[PDB]
Design a protein around this ligand. Structure first.
Ligand code: CLA
Ligand code: CLA
Ligand code: CLA
Ligand code: CLA
Ligand code: CLA
Ligand code: CLA
Ligand code: CLA
Ligand SMILES: CC1=C(C#C/C(C)=C/C=C/C(C)=C/C=C/C=C(C)/C=C/C=C(\C)C#CC2=C(C)C[C@@H](O)CC2(C)C)C(C)(C)C[C@H](O)C1
Ligand SMILES: CC1=C(C#C/C(C)=C/C=C/C(C)=C/C=C/C=C(C)/C=C/C=C(\C)C#CC2=C(C)C[C@@H](O)CC2(C)C)C(C)(C)C[C@H](O)C1
Ligand SMILES: CC1=C(C#C/C(C)=C/C=C/C(C)=C/C=C/C=C(C)/C=C/C=C(C)/C=C/C2=C(C)CCCC2(C)C)C(C)(C)C[C@H](O)C1
Ligand SMILES: CC1=C(C#C/C(C)=C/C=C/C(C)=C/C=C/C=C(C)/C=C/C=C(C)/C=C/C2=C(C)CCCC2(C)C)C(C)(C)C[C@H](O)C1
Lengths: 180, 90, 172, 175
């Protein structure tokens, strides 16, 4: 439905969250649909964290981070923190901590993705993380649509923020305000 | 000509199917095919990284990178086990 | 399905009756290694770590008469480097190894199934007579041991990065 | 029946009009000895690799990727200018694609059509006449690319340049 010229493949079911008939290039046939679906949800989240991160870091700095950062923006900080870590700074191991912990989360959840492909009860992208219980208390499946849609928006937005940074040093908040 | 002894727990491993039974994986008979395939790719990347970081070998090589470099041949046997487990429905 | 990890499947080799059961085996390592071997290995780690965590804490609190002369300032791992030069580390190693030689025999009995994993029948004072207090206390030993495993690594790494030692790191 | 390619020779028995690029051309009878479906899929795979190879031998005349912009336009020198990490990644990618033909031929040989690796993302071949035309077009363009790459490769051996460069400089002959 999204592209009238080239509709979505019959491989895509219509009862999945975020289904709005958009697959003109038919990429679903090449790879397992469950693997692709979980890949999109994982990209959604990592991007959403990055998009909110890019905005927040420009908007606010935690106390004492400014001295190590100097004046680096969202992409620059990563290079600066690793450069200081190369020198041997204990304070500059922040990147290593997040790499270790995100990797640990991926390593513990490693079986889960294959279990979804194997036919296990877990649906792709669901880890049953509801401490708030907002989805359980309310109706689930409307926020799932919001999570995929906002995630797609964030995916594109993170690309916008990074490429804008590489061309011109300005990060997100500054780039939106200024109009070169 | 006399009974040939085998260790206790020796079972039959001759196969003519698409894949051998998972019993040929020994202690890894119950591991899922996804778990071997992910362990195989993980072992290939960390083993290749650990191998690559010490290719100019020094009189002080990092012992963890040497030990981690053994994951590259181990990854070969892991993906063979991944193929065996997928073809056994595991 | 699993209690601790809701998305993943219930671990096949793990049961509620076993002490410290939360259904936690995300990597499925119970299939790879014999569960009785794993259970005894966990209990051995739990007890050695429990002694080690309390050890670090107690050594910061106080030392035994004369140890301060033998090791001038090194604590945690550093005192071990001094004690291999003296005889304390070797003598403890000789006696722990001798007990582990009987432990090897006990491990063989456990793999047979004759002996429960980690059960060396050591009750000088009988605090597990009730047999439900025994279930609770085994759960406590496992839980405090897992915590101590984490804690022992935590405080030793604090020594590696700062040299302070466990209590001193908090005080400084 | 007689061959349509060679009208004085009898029709080779194990090739048929059903196959997309059929011309009746098997003067030395490979298909009466080898499996015709194995030869079919093998011909199709050689052609697909050669179609990319022909395009790949011609394309760095026009433009290069920015990383390999410094590399030579002679393909047989650009072969050695690529790093072995690069060739290892190319080999790993080709191998991943082959894992599918390993299933399609060494295990699932009879189920399907030769060369049918389930790669139809834009949902072509839905219209049957269009499917027929595309099948014959793939086989003929693959054979043409095999001949063309064979040419352009040996032309790059004789004159150490790309085929288009050899053409414009008119270095058509061994010198
Ligand atoms: C949860 C986030 C958080 C919080 C609450 C703080 C809070 C604080 N930081 Mg900061 N800091 C953070 C994250 C955070 N930090 C991160 C992520 C980094 C970089 C990896 C730093 C790097 C940093 C440096 C380099 C320093 C501080 C210092 C300080 C303390 C003094 C305030 C100041 O100098 O202004 C203050 C309590 C300073 C400090 O220790 O002074 C006592 C100081 O020198 N911080
Ligand atoms: C618009 C945001 C949004 C929405 C609606 C959802 C919706 C959902 N998620 Mg997803 N998720 C998101 C973002 C979102 N997610 C991001 C960014 C992460 C990464 C941390 C995750 C990680 C995640 C996991 C790991 C899991 C879910 C799960 C769920 C479900 C639980 C229902 C629920 O209570 O969530 C309601 C959620 C919200 C209403 C979002 C609240 C956002 C507020 C505003 C906080 C923002 C804080 C942020 C850091 C500040 C940004 C502003 C800054 C720039 C100034 C539902 C499908 C669970 C699931 O599918 O299984 C049942 C599950 O296992 N999500
Ligand atoms: C993993 C355990 C472990 C290890 C390797 C060490 C190692 C060491 N300790 Mg520490 N220590 C421990 C536990 C440990 N301790 C515990 C639990 C305490 C609290 C009582 C202490 C309190 C302590 C002090 C106060 C001092 C040391 C000191 C030392 C050093 C000299 C040896 C000595 O005098 O120990 C003495 C330790 C003890 C007398 C208590 C340990 C006795 C345990 C309970 C043995 C039990 C084994 C068990 C029953 C086996 C069961 C067998 C089963 C099969 C049936 C050495 C670095 C000295 C040092 O270097 O300080 C800087 C020192 O002065 N230790
Ligand atoms: C591995 C542990 C260890 C080590 C290396 C030492 C080392 C030493 N002790 Mg011993 N001691 C230990 C444990 C240890 N103690 C224990 C567990 C006790 C029982 C509480 C004692 C009880 C003890 C007494 C009673 C005395 C020493 C004394 C001494 C020191 C003699 C030289 C000196 O300071 O003058 C010597 C270095 C002597 C000393 O100087 O103490 C004031 C002394 O008289 N020790
Ligand atoms: C359950 C036991 C336990 C306890 C009580 C602690 C407690 C502590 N650790 Mg330890 N740690 C533990 C386990 C534990 N850790 C384990 C299992 C490891 C891995 C081996 C470490 C490795 C570790 C290192 C390497 C360091 C600490 C540090 C710290 C201190 C500050 C951490 C903080 O607030 O930032 C937490 C930050 C967050 C973003 C939390 C979310 C704090 C006293 C740090 C320190 O010395 O500070 C004084 C430090 O450098 N810990
Ligand atoms: C048999 C095929 C083949 C082989 C062995 C090579 C080998 C090489 N090429 Mg050539 N190349 C090829 C095909 C090939 N190429 C094709 C088809 C093109 C046109 C796009 C090019 C264009 C090209 C340029 C512009 C450059 C190279 C370069 C190189 C070298 C470095 C690797 C690289 O960047 O490759 C790039 C090769 C590709 C990107 C081809 C990918 C072919 C895939 C498999 C087909 C894609 C399938 C289809 C699009 C899927 C769509 C799905 C649908 C949803 C849309 C190496 C010697 C570089 C060099 O050193 O030259 C001096 C360089 O700068 N190649
Ligand atoms: C002339 C080329 C040509 C044609 C007609 C076909 C035709 C076909 N292929 Mg095939 N294929 C080709 C080349 C071609 N292929 C090459 C080179 C490869 C290797 C990358 C493949 C790999 C491939 C696989 C792996 C599979 C097929 C399959 C199919 C069939 C169904 C899909 C379909 O209808 O696509 C129609 C395709 C076209 C109409 C080709 C047009 C492509 C574009 C529009 C033009 C070329 C663009 C080019 C990259 C840019 C040139 C730049 C330059 C001019 C400057 C059909 C028989 C599938 C099947 O089931 O087979 C039976 C299957 O599994 N093909
Ligand atoms: C889910 C879950 C939990 C949780 C949680 C969490 C952490 C939820 C977090 C949700 C978040 C952080 C959502 C943020 C999405 C970001 C978007 C859509 C931005 C896109 C970028 C755009 C539009 C742009 C842009 C830009 C361009 C390119 C150039 C820039 O110069 C400027 C500009 C800005 C204009 C809880 C605890 C609630 C429990 C619950 O039971 C389950
Ligand atoms: C399958 C599929 C699709 C697809 C697709 C794709 C990627 C299709 C790719 C098709 C390609 C790359 C075809 C290239 C063919 C090249 C040929 C025939 C060259 C021959 C060279 C010759 C004759 C020569 C020569 C030379 C000689 C020897 C002498 C020289 O001096 C000069 C000269 C140059 C003349 C899509 C993605 C649309 C989706 C769909 O749902 C399914
Ligand atoms: C950390 C680090 C770095 C980094 C980094 C990062 C975070 C890089 C992130 C890169 C990303 C996320 C790029 C994505 C861009 C989105 C695109 C191109 C969408 C295009 C839209 C399309 C095609 C069509 C859209 C369409 C339209 C018309 C609207 C409707 C929808 C649709 C029909 C689909 C480095 C690399 C600099 C290294 C450095 O050492 C430090
Ligand atoms: C080398 C040396 C010496 C020494 C020594 C010693 C004593 C070395 C001991 C090292 C130890 C015990 C390290 C422990 C590491 C534990 C880890 C990383 C677990 C982390 C928790 C994780 C990943 C997640 C936890 C989790 C959390 C947060 C929430 C999710 C769930 C959960 C799983 C609970 C000597 C003495 C010989 C001296 C010699 O001269 C040099």
């Amino acid at each position: 439905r999204a592209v009238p010229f080239a509709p979505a493949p019959d491989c895509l079911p219509e009862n999945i969250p975020g289904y709005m008939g958009f697959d003109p290039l038919g990429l679903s046939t090449l790879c397992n649909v469950e693997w692709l679906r979980e890949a999109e949800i994982k990209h959604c989240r990592v991007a959403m964290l990055a998009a909110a991160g890019s905005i927040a870091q420009d908007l606010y700095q935690f106390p004492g981070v400014e001295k190590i950062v100097g004046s680096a923006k969202m992409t620059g900080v990563h290079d600066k923190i690793l450069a200081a870590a190369s020198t041997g700074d204990y304070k500059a191991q922040a990147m290593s901590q997040i790499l270790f912990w995100t990797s640990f989360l991926e390593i513990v959840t490693l079986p889960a993705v294959f279990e979804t492909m194997n036919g296990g009860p877990r649906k792709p992208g669901v880890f049953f993380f509801d401490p708030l219980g907002l989805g359980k208390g309310d109706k689930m499946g409307e926020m799932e649509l919001k999570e995929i849609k906002n995630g797609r928006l964030a995916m594109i937005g993170v690309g916008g923020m990074v490429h804008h940074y590489l061309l011109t040093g300005k990060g997100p908040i500054q780039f939106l305000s200024g109009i070169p | 000509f006399s009974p040939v002894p085998s260790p206790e727990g020796t079972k039959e491993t001759y196969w003519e199917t698409k894949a051998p039974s998972s019993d040929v994986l020994g202690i890894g008979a119950g591991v899922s095919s996804g778990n071997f395939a992910a362990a195989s790719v993980f072992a290939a990347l960390v083993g290749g990284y650990c191998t690559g970081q010490v290719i100019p070998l020094t009189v002080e090589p990092n012992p963890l990178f040497l030990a981690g470099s053994f994951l590259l041949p181990y990854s070969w046997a892991l993906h063979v086990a991944a193929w065996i487990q997928k073809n056994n429905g595991k | 399905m699993s209690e601790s990890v809701p998305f993943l499947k219930k671990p096949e080799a793990l049961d509620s009756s076993m002490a410290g059961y939360a259904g936690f085996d995300p990597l499925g390592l119970s299939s790879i290694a014999d569960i009785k071997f794993l259970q005894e290995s966990e209990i051995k780690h739990c007890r050695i770590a429990m002694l080690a965590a309390a050890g670090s804490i107690a050594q910061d609190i106080f030392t035994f008469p004369g140890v301060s002369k033998v090791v001038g300032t090194a604590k945690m791992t550093g005192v071990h480097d001094v004690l291999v030069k003296q005889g304390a580390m070797g003598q403890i190693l000789l006696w722990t190894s001798f007990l582990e030689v009987f432990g090897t025999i006990a491990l063989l009995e456990t793999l047979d199934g004759k002996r429960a994993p980690g059960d060396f029948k050591f009750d000088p004072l009988g605090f597990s007579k009730n047999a439900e207090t025994a279930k609770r206390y085994q759960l406590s030993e496992i839980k405090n041991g897992r915590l101590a495993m984490l804690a022992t690594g935590g405080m030793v790494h604090g020594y590696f990065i700062t040299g302070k030692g466990p209590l001193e790191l908090l005080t400084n | 029946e007689m061959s349509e390619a060679i009208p004085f020779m009898p029709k080779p028995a194990n090739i048929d009009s059903s196959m997309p690029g059929y011309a009746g051309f098997d003067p030395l009878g490979f298909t009466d000895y080898y499996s015709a479906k194995w030869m079919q899929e093998a011909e199709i795979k050689h052609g697909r690799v050669c179609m990319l190879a022909a395009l790949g031998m011609v394309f760095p005349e026009f433009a290069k990727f920015p990383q390999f912009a410094s590399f030579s336009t002679n393909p047989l020198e650009a072969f050695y200018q690529v790093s072995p990490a690069g060739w290892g990644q190319i080999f790993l990618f080709i191998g991943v694609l082959e894992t599918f033909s390993y299933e399609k031929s060494f295990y699932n040989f009879e189920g399907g059509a030769p060369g049918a690796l389930g790669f139809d993302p834009l949902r072509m071949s839905s219209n049957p006449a269009s499917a027929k035309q595309y099948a014959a077009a793939e086989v003929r363009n693959g054979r043409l690319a095999m001949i063309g790459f064979s040419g352009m490769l040996h032309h790059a051996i004789v004159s150490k340049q790309g085929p288009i460069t050899q053409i414009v400089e008119q270095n058509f002959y061994p010198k």
